Amino acid sequence: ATAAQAERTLPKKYGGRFTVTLIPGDGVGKEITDSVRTIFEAENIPIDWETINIKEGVYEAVESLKRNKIGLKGLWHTPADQTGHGSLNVALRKQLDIYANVALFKSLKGVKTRIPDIDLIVIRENTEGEFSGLEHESVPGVVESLKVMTRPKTERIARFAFDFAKKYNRKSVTAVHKANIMKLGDGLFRNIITEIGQKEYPDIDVSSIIVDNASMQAVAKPHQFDVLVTPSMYGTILGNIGAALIGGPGLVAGANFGRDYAVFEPGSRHVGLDIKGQNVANPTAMILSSTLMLNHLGLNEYATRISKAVHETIAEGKHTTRDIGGSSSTTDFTNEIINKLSTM
Amino acid sequence: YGGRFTVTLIPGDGVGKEITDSVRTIFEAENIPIDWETINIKEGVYEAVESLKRNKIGLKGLWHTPADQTGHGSLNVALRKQLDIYANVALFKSLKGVKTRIPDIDLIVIRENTEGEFSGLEHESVPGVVESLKVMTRPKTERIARFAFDFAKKYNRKSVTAVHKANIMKLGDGLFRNIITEIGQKEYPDIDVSSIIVDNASMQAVAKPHQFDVLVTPSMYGTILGNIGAALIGGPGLVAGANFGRDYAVFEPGSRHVGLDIKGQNVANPTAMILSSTLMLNHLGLNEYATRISKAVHETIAEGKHTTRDIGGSSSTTDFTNEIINKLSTM
Amino acid sequence: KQPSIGRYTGKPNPSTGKYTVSFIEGDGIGPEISKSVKKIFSAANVPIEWESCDVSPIFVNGLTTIPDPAVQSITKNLVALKGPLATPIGRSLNLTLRKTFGLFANVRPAKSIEGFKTTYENVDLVLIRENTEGEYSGIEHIVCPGVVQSIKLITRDASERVIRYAFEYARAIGRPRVIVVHKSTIQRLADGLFVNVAKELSKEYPDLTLETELIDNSVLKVVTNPSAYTDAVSVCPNLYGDILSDLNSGLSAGSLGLTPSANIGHKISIFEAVHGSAPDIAGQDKANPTALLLSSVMMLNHMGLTNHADQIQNAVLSTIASGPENRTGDLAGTATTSSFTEAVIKRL
Amino acid sequence: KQPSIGRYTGKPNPSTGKYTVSFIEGDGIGPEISKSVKKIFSAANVPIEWESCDVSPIFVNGLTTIPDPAVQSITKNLVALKGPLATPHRSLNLTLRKTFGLFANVRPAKSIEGFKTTYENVDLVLIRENTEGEYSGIEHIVCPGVVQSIKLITRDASERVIRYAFEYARAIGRPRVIVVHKSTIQRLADGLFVNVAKELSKEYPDLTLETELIDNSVLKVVTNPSAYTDAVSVCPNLYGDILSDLNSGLSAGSLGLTPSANIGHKISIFEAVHGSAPDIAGQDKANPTALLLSSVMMLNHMGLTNHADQIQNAVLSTIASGPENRTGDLAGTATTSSFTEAVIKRL
């Protein structure tokens, strides 16, 4: 039998038209997604959004992505109270085994930053580590949170990172860990990475760095880093350092990869609850990771295109959005992109 | 036949040294073509492992295990865990010349050796609060489950029962009870699979043991049902045992008692050791010998006096051995 | 004297000469087995009035709770006597019963019965079991795909108060020895702590002698010879206790239709029979009060009514269970629950 | 009023006007960096005599212990001031906290006058739990390729850190106190920490309690360090270890200027957090500033306000202005020697 007609495993596509999943999510999510929609139909990109909205219908997001294979999403909100529901950003990833997060911290021309000309990538494991969500209270007032680290899940991310570094001509890959204290947990992580960066991927420079010291170099001398591989937590931390380094959470493209699926989201991971509905938000993040998705499903003439649009727009002084130092609204910034785009 | 085989011998602590010797004597007196590579020992449990890895087969007594805090840890389990000899078989079959409260009893207890409450993971969070972690994994459990059924099939056993506490430890023992019954239904359909809760199992075992055939248990419940069975048939000196991994096999008494108190007294009973010693012969294919020297000890003990202390006799380990070698010299 | 640990706070209801005790008839053979006790109690002039209450569970917050009616009743009268109950129509009933009343120690005796022949003889056993933590804390995890952890919890606080009640109970029934069943062999820390806590308490109870035994031997020795522990009282963590107690009963009677349990809490305490609801024999008057009846005796002693307890046990039931015209179907006997109760009260 | 929680029990040695303080010169640049402090302290007439002791570890029961000489000394004088030491079988610094009941790391990072780094107006204060959390010894191999590291969080340990934070925030006149956490995905663990702060919040009504995810704590601090110049942030062991080393990265780009204070219930040790700098040792190039500021922290902890403010507000802080002063590490040309006299002048 099988091979040609088979292929129930590529991205939903009908006579040239992809069907991508759209999950606006909470906070500036709804606005920042819209920005992309507008730039998309204004460029007449052959994709149709299947768009979903939601407490445990995080089911319907999963089920959708399982059909379409590809998605574009903002962030959901997560409670801190005890009877709160639990991430369901992580739920989405765990249930689809989208185990690899990539965040892209590259500074942008028209943006004032304290240390300029910075280009580093942070790859984190999504399903394990301190995000394993195993915890219990033995006796009252004593709580244990269990942090799982397993060879299989770790070999996986390790190869993803190197594969990624090879594909995008990155010369250095560094494992962030705390192996001097958690000798088994983070130890295993540091070994497996360096171990399989030496007997496979010999062309790439593998190294380790202790998470706290990594945090210090990142803030003080970031140019020394190229690609960083981390477990769930250290990636949130180095991530936000990188986010700040380049301007803010609104400039960071992100993507999540599993073997079968791919979900693209902002690389910084902030909801912007406070400025919801104010049309003050910055869609650079969303759009740029939206371009990442195009390159993925093979379009990328469009991607190469609409990235240059936003890149030039923000470099070109005013008409840029609030947080970069402009006075324009999400709406106005979007239209400058679609405008620059209409003349390419 | 023709050729020689090199088996590992680990006498170990307590009556170990005497009870092994009994076997040696019966072996050279029967001129069995096996040569002992014999080892003695704190952390040279390494050399035991390394030996067994060469020879693949072994015959051993029990080592002693401390209860104090700075004591070393089983190293009976260490041996097994490091060789992944994951399956323990104990044979509780009553013997003719032995007074027991319930007679004509024949049951087998298969336990998993490497996992469960023998996983030895524990910690003290704050002072005075201790957690012991009990691991149960599908792979290790599917393994023992099949071993049990395979075993039951091979030795024409009709019933296999999983002992558990799944009503309370719904994930741990739950997984165990499912995986067993689950793969006794879609494979091994000829065999009767069932479950029983460990505490109730313990009650039936003591009161009405004939209802059981083969019992499959995690590390702890096997120690418990094991000792019930040990008592049921006479005592720890009558129980043959064996441990199996995929590559290796180590034969030991099925009751697992050191006899520290009677070390060097020559009062000990070697039936256990010898009988599991015959298990080993059947294994490495001899078993003409095995069939032989088992009938020897079986008849010896059935034949009233000349039997060893604990069975109700007045003979010493030395004397009992020699009656076997004697009965043996006339076959 | 009584064990200091779970001490009853008496106080007979000033308006009547009597003490107040919650019943909980339970279901199945519960009702018949119950009033069987009420009658026998009446006849012997027990200073006790019954305040029956219903533990049929509510479900406040999805987590099964027990009704206020029954809570107030049982917290008030510091004692209750429950029969068997079913497996409720949809977070263990018995568990939320211990958790809401702070019960922490299971006391389980298994003694041979006069005139009922089983395979084991002269078995007179007493075992105290930790019923709070150990293997039976709710803590278990899926650490990854095919890997599970069940967590055994052992604390000094929980261990201390069980081990105490054991020393004090051993003293209260005149047994010299008290044995700590354990497995420090391979559970160094967990069972080690339990053992040390007994060894340290040992000193403030110099009349009793403390021994330590591995379940290995505890089970081996008891089955080979049950009487070697007739001066016993064994204390042990939750799991070893659950098994050894069901085992001990298997030795004494071959089932547990004769076994009484006592669940001691700090200020409250519940006394129950450990057999089931026997739904198929219910109403037909074939049940056997002996089980619950002996739990009544245990209760009496816990309350201080020595004279009555000894009366209802030493004579009555224990003695009326001699002569097959008495007895019940479960013991070869021919008598009904009905005839057993009057046949009992005669020698009361 | 200094924080009730780690209160110094004064008592100057009745025979001398002075208080007794254990030193622990430490090794490497320790000796030179040390007497540098002894001199500056002398000049300002500090009520303090030095009882130097050696923490070179013994090994009672395979487990590394600390010498009786030093134990008696430090338990006696309720305070000590250690410089950097090398890496001699149980973390030396760990068995140091365990034997003296130290439970709270206090880490300030403030911009230095006359030393230009990339970040400006950074004035940060962070209290870190140094007992439990991610850093309890508890980890397990649950089977072949599977490991568990166990994070421990208790109310008792949390309470007393969070207290010292409210009380320290009060003692230095900062209005706000921020509990860094991640209740988001560590519901129980970090949740307990947070609730314990929220509950303590009420018996300290002069301070305002905020709660922040490390997410934002790191994002916001790097975008704008000054937003926390009325700070005092409290957090569990790991977040603390990282944020503090981060904060230092913002303030000075390294940590050759960073002072730490390790507060215990009745004892307390004050150390510099830089290394032994073995290669610059003896050549008189070290930079006392780090240890020196820990001296100041110590003074305040002891109650000697006037002297502390004296040695900090003037001196060092001010003498680190003019490149003829300063040290090699700050572009300066001065020696450890010349820095110390150049300091004492404005002392």
From Swiss-Prot, chain B:
Substrate binds at residues 80, 111, 199. It catalyses: D-threo-isocitrate + NAD(+) = 2-oxoglutarate + CO2 + NADH. One of its GO terms (biological process) is glutamate biosynthetic process. Its main location: mitochondrion. Binds 1 Mg(2+) or Mn(2+) ion per subunit. The keyword Magnesium applies. It comes from the Eukaryota. GO terms for molecular function: isocitrate dehydrogenase (NAD+) activity; magnesium ion binding; NAD binding; RNA binding. SMART domains: Iso_dh. Keywords: Allosteric enzyme, Magnesium, Manganese, Metal-binding, Mitochondrion, NAD, Oxidoreductase, RNA-binding, Transit peptide, Tricarboxylic acid cycle. The keyword Manganese applies. It holds the Pfam family Iso_dh. Mg(2+) binds at residue 199. Its cofactor is Mg(2+); Mn(2+). Allosterically regulated by several compounds including AMP, NAD(+), and citrate. PROSITE patterns: IDH_IMDH (PS00470). Octamer of two non-identical subunits IDH1 and IDH2. Belongs to the isocitrate and isopropylmalate dehydrogenases family. This is Isocitrate dehydrogenase [NAD] subunit 1, mitochondrial. It comes from Saccharomyces cerevisiae (strain ATCC 204508 / S288c) (Baker's yeast). The gene is IDH1.
Curated annotation (Swiss-Prot), chain C:
Gene3D superfamilies: Isopropylmalate Dehydrogenase (3.40.718.10). GO terms for biological process: glutamate biosynthetic process; isocitrate metabolic process; tricarboxylic acid cycle. InterPro entries: IsoCit/isopropylmalate_DH_CS, Isocitrate_DH_NAD, IsoPropMal-DH-like_dom. Keywords: Allosteric enzyme, Magnesium, Manganese, Metal-binding, Mitochondrion, NAD, Oxidoreductase, Phosphoprotein, RNA-binding, Transit peptide, Tricarboxylic acid cycle. Its main location: mitochondrion. This is Isocitrate dehydrogenase [NAD] subunit 2, mitochondrial. One of its GO terms (cellular component) is isocitrate dehydrogenase complex (NAD+). Present with 43100 molecules/cell in log phase SD medium. SUPFAM superfamilies: Isocitrate/Isopropylmalate dehydrogenase-like (SSF53659). Allosterically regulated by several compounds including AMP, NAD(+), and citrate. The gene is IDH2. It comes from the Eukaryota. GO terms for molecular function: isocitrate dehydrogenase (NAD+) activity; magnesium ion binding; NAD binding; RNA binding. It comes from Saccharomyces cerevisiae (strain ATCC 204508 / S288c). Its cofactor is Mg(2+); Mn(2+).
Swiss-Prot record, chain D:
GO terms for molecular function: isocitrate dehydrogenase (NAD+) activity; magnesium ion binding; NAD binding; RNA binding. It is an enzyme of class 1 (oxidoreductase). The keyword Oxidoreductase applies. GO terms for biological process: glutamate biosynthetic process; isocitrate metabolic process; tricarboxylic acid cycle. The keyword Transmembrane does not apply. Pfam families: Iso_dh. One of its GO terms (cellular component) is mitochondrion. The record marks 135, 182 as: Critical for catalysis. Substrate binds at residues 97, 107, 128, 215. Mg(2+) binds at residues 215, 241, 245. It comes from the Eukaryota. Its EC number is 1.1.1.41. NCBIfam families: mito_nad_idh (TIGR00175). Present with 43100 molecules/cell in log phase SD medium. PANTHER family: DECARBOXYLATING DEHYDROGENASES-ISOCITRATE, ISOPROPYLMALATE, TARTRATE, ISOCITRATE DEHYDROGENASE [NAD] SUBUNIT ALPHA, MITOCHONDRIAL. Performs an essential role in the oxidative function of the citric acid cycle. Also binds RNA; specifically to the 5'-untranslated leaders of mitochondrial mRNAs. Octamer of two non-identical subunits IDH1 and IDH2. This is Isocitrate dehydrogenase [NAD] subunit 2, mitochondrial. The gene is IDH2.
